[PDB]
Structure 1
Amino acid sequence: TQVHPRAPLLQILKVAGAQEEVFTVKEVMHYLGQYIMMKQLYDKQRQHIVHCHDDPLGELLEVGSFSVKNPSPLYEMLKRNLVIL
């Protein structure tokens, strides 16, 4: 299934290197991972924790941090920011 990210999410994916406008959810997850990795938002010591306060990703997630093992804010963000084609 193909999705079109809303502008603010699309901005983030492009920072992370995405050249597409339409994505699969798998590709969106790939580029979010890339973004977090590139911007070094993960906690250095406990790397399942992602600190996104004072980053545009935090504005989309509406949270200052999240755990890769408690990913619902990520998924809820994607629900708000992906239009299914």
Structure 2
Amino acid sequence: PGEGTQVHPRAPLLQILKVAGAQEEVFTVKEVMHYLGQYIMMKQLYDKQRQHIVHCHDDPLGELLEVGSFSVKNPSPLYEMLKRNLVIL
């Protein structure tokens, strides 16, 4: 979904975006990615030394991604999670 597509995220993903500050029920994919970055940043999930690595184990984000960690340069787990967690409007 790329063409400024409008989406409603499933409950578990929506809870995460609202923690990141989203006061919203409808998003574009771009807006979802914005709030995902916000979340990782504010919960400081990225590795301190190697900041492309995100440690999401023992966080609700890990529950959705289904991995303990991921690289932002290997973002497949993220896009897969979004395929499962976004309803197209």
TM over 0.5: same fold? yes
1:12, CA displacement in angstroms? 0.1
Q: Provide the aligned length of Structure 1 versus Structure 2.
A: 85
Structure 2 unaligned residues grouped into runs of 5+: none
Cα root mean square deviation, aligned: 0.2
Cα displacement string for residues 60-80 of structure 1 (whole angstroms, at most 9, x for unaligned residues): 000000000000000000000
Output the TM-score relative to the length of structure 2: 0.95
> What is the DSSP-based 3-state SS (H/G/I as helix, E as strand, rest coil) of the residue aligned with 1:83?
strand
Cα displacement string for residues 19-58 of structure 1 (whole angstroms, at most 9, x for unaligned residues): 0100000000000000000000000000000000000000
> What is the DSSP-based 3-state SS (H/G/I as helix, E as strand, rest coil) of the residue aligned with 1:73?
helix
1:79 paired residue among 79, 83, 87: 83
Structure 1 unaligned residues grouped into runs of 5+: none
Give runs of ≥4 in structure 1 deviating > 6 Å. none
